[PDB]
Structure formats: structure tokens, C-alpha cells
Amino acid sequence: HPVTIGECPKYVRSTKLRMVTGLRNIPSAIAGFIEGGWTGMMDGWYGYHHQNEQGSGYAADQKSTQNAINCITNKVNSVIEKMNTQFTAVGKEFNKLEKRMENLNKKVDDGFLDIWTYNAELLVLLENERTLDFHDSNVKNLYEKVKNQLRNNAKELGNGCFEFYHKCDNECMESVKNGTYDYPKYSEESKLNREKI
Amino acid sequence: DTICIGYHANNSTDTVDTVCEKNVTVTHSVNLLED
């Protein structure tokens, strides 16, 4: 109802206003972002999956998830503090010979509501698309970083996955996970297995 | 010896609207409307 007393939210004639804070839900031989997402990861939004001789497991990237969560939190607080909301109106009454004032008051009251409704819907439908594009960009940066670290040691299958030519154990997987993967110690066996094939 | 890069999914049925597409399923969402 438009008539409010106290500290009250702003009145809009909208039925649904929902804002994205997460990813797109695309469910589903574990493959990368081209096939879809993984249900079995509950540590973070973005991450890795390793399958080797010792075992198979999932892991999450903490830094990218934390930066994304910080930007989405700032987005939420920007939406909340942008529209300061306070006592708006109580309504006025007019007699039978002040019809022009009554129509002017209705014109003002019905002209502000349209502007505020239009502004709220535009804000939601722009910020949702910005959030989704930001998530896709972050996944692309992780893929580029892992590719740039591995170079010629591993082959691309497409589908966001890499197959190691050499033998890569758990410390080898954690080396490319945390950003410190030294090239030369695994280069020779990878050269042999690449040239033999 | 395979490493892959992907993201997180669950069983949520929350839907939002964008400029290209309507009824887009998302993992998490916040309601800004009180009714």
C-alpha cells in the first residue's frame, strides 16, 4: 500500500524483483565448463577436479571465489543503500470545489510511481546480466591460467580438461592448483611421450 | 592423469529474468520485494 508511516520500503507496482547472487544451474567422465557444472563440489564456486593413480577428488579455488563474493556483496549493499527509503505521504482530502487540486495531487502521485518502478526493474535486469558475464569471465581466466602454466606438458581434449603426458601425482596436481608449477623437471618425459606418439 | 576446470551446481529451482532470456535457473538469488 502506498500510504506508510515510519521507516518503510519504497512502494512499486512490481510482482517479482529477484537478483542473482550465484551461477547458472546447468547440471552435468568428468568434463569441464563446456559440458556443464559439477554437483559434487560444495567447497566453492570455482574449482578443479583431479583423477590420478592415487585417487580422484574435487577442490575449490579460494581466491577467485572470495573476490567474486566480495563484488556481489558490494553489489547488494549498493542496491540497498542507493534507494534511501523514508516516510513518504499520508494523503490529503479536498472538497467538491477543489477538483483541480485533487487531480494535480493524483498526477504527481501517479507520475512518481511509474518512474520509480521503471528504475527498479532496469536496475535488476542490468545487474543480473553483469553478474552472469562476470562469472563466465572468471571461469575463462582460470582456464587460461592453467593452460599458460602447463604449456606443452599436457594435451587439450577440448571440454575444459587437460591430459598429462608425464606422470603427475598429488603434489604435482597441487603445484598447478596453487600457482607454482615448475616446467623443467617434467619436461623430458613429456617430450619422450609426445615424440613417441 | 587429468585435471579439469568447472563450476558449482545444485538442485535449486530459482528463476530470474535477463535482457536476452527469461526464466533462467540460478543457484542462489535474493528477493528485494516485500509482500
Epitope: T21, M42, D43, G44, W45, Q62, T65, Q66, I69, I72, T73, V76, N77, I80, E81 | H8, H28, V30, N31
Partner: antibody, heavy 126, light 112 residues
């Protein structure tokens, strides 16, 4: 009943390493976030850092270089290791536990809740 | 970090009178899950701290009904309707949204 008890040395010399252990009884260690909080005499509380069972320690930016935490499920013990101690580190130390939900993804990326506190141990540096 | 400001430092009240403590934040404390995460703690003299209010309005089990907290955006308030002899001590406000976890300055309650 979840009961937490602290034990450690009262006196440490300067430039040494201070160690405290927070023995937990009544509940498993895997179901909680574990945090350390220090308080100087007649001053404000200060948060040091937190740890969960799989393993990550996020500590306060100021005390990041000199802090190290660990947890053992066999003896149900939570440990602190503070290196290069100074006379400004004289404080009462508390260990706190908060609830962990494995389905909640975002809960790993905010400060943990503080539900069950501990008795506290006094450490002076002289 | 994020700065908490409490008012007043000392609030002497008489038995059977209401009291109010105010906590203010430099930043908004809303999280992306839809919550605020501000807590109110009590410390008796020579004892460990215990919690009174978890989140803006929710009250912990074992806490008396005279403790009520409310607030929004950047200003929050804890109110005690009746003050007894077990209400002495120092009260703090804490935020758990942004890294690192920051505590308030502290408000001391004395009986007149």
C-alpha cells in the same frame, strides 16, 4: 554438553614461540569452525584467526606472518603457535567454536560464528 | 577493516529502568545470502564472554526476554527493558560479514 578447556604456559621470554592447546570434550572436532581471540588487559577484543577440519587458516591481516594453527582429531586438540613474541602480546586467550554446515558454500567465505567460548588463559611476556 | 562505534561508553541506570546501547558501522553489513550477521556479547567481571544476540533480531537460548536488539543498514541498538543485578558488565557488538572479524569498543553498565 560441549565443554572447552584451555591449557598452556603462563610465562614466555621475548623472541620465543608461545603455544596454547584448547582441549575439547563432548563433541567432534570436524563439525565446527575453530577460532582464537585475544584480549589485552582493559582493552578491546581482537580476533586472531580460524581453521576447519579439511584445512585452511585465515588470520587477521596484522598478525598473519607470526601465526600458525593446527587441529588433531585423535586427541581432539586445537593448537596455536605465535612466533616472535613481544611485550604487547600480554593477553587473555579464548578459543571459540562455531557451527559448520557442509551444504552451505558461502559459509567458508565469511567470518565464522562464535557460539561456545572457553575459560581463557593468561599469557605475560617478560 | 570495518570500524564499530558504540555509544555511550558508560551508561549508569537504576534498578527497574530501561537502557539502550547503540552500535554504528562504517559499511553496510548485508551479505549475499540475505542476512546481516551482527552479534551482541556480554562480559561479566572476571569471566569469559557469552553471547546474547545472534543476527539483528534473533535471541540465543538461555538469554532472558528482557534483552531485545534491532536495527538496520548502519545503525543497530540493544535495549534492556528491566535492569537487574545480573546485568552488570561490559557489552560489545561484533560483525561477521567482512574479513576480518571486528569487535566493538565496549559499554560498561553500572547500577545507581
Amino acid at each position: 554438553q560441549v565443554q572447552l578447556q584451555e591449557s598452556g604456559p603462563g610465562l614466555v621470554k621475548p623472541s620465543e614461540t608461545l603455544s596454547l592447546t584448547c582441549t575439547v570434550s563432548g563433541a567432534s572436532v570436524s563439525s565446527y569452525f575453530w577460532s582464537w581471540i585475544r584480549q589485552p588487559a582493559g582493552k578491546a577484543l581482537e580476533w586472531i584467526g580460524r581453521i576447519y577440519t579439511s584445512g585452511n587458516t585465515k588470520s587477521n591481516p596484522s598478525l598473519e606472518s607470526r601465526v600458525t594453527m593446527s587441529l588433531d582429531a585423535s586427541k581432539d586438540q586445537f593448537s596455536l603457535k605465535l612466533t616472535s613474541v613481544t611485550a604487547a602480546d600480554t593477553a587473555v586467550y579464548y578459543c571459540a567454536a562455531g557451527r559448520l554446515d557442509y551444504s552451505d558454500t558461502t559459509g567458508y567465505y565469511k567470518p565464522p560464528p562464535l557460539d561456545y567460548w572457553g575459560q581463557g588463559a593468561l599469557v605475560t611476556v617478560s | 577493516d570495518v570500524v564499530m562505534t558504540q555509544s555511550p561508553l558508560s551508561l549508569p541506570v537504576t534498578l527497574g529502568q530501561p537502557a539502550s546501547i547503540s552500535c554504528r558501522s562504517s559499511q553496510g553489513l548485508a551479505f549475499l545470502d540475505g542476512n546481516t550477521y551482527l552479534s551482541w556479547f556480554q562480559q561479566r567481571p572476571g569471566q569469559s564472554p557469552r553471547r546474547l544476540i545472534y543476527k539483528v533480531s534473533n535471541r540465543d537460548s538461555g538469554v532472558p526476554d528482557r534483552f531485545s536488539g534491532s536495527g538496520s543498514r548502519t545503525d543497530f541498538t540493544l535495549k534492556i527493558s528491566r535492569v537487574e543485578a545480573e546485568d552488570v558488565g561490559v557489552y560489545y557488538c561484533m560483525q561477521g560479514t567482512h574479513w576480518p572479524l571486528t569487535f566493538g569498543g565496549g559499554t560498561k553498565v553500572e547500577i545507581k
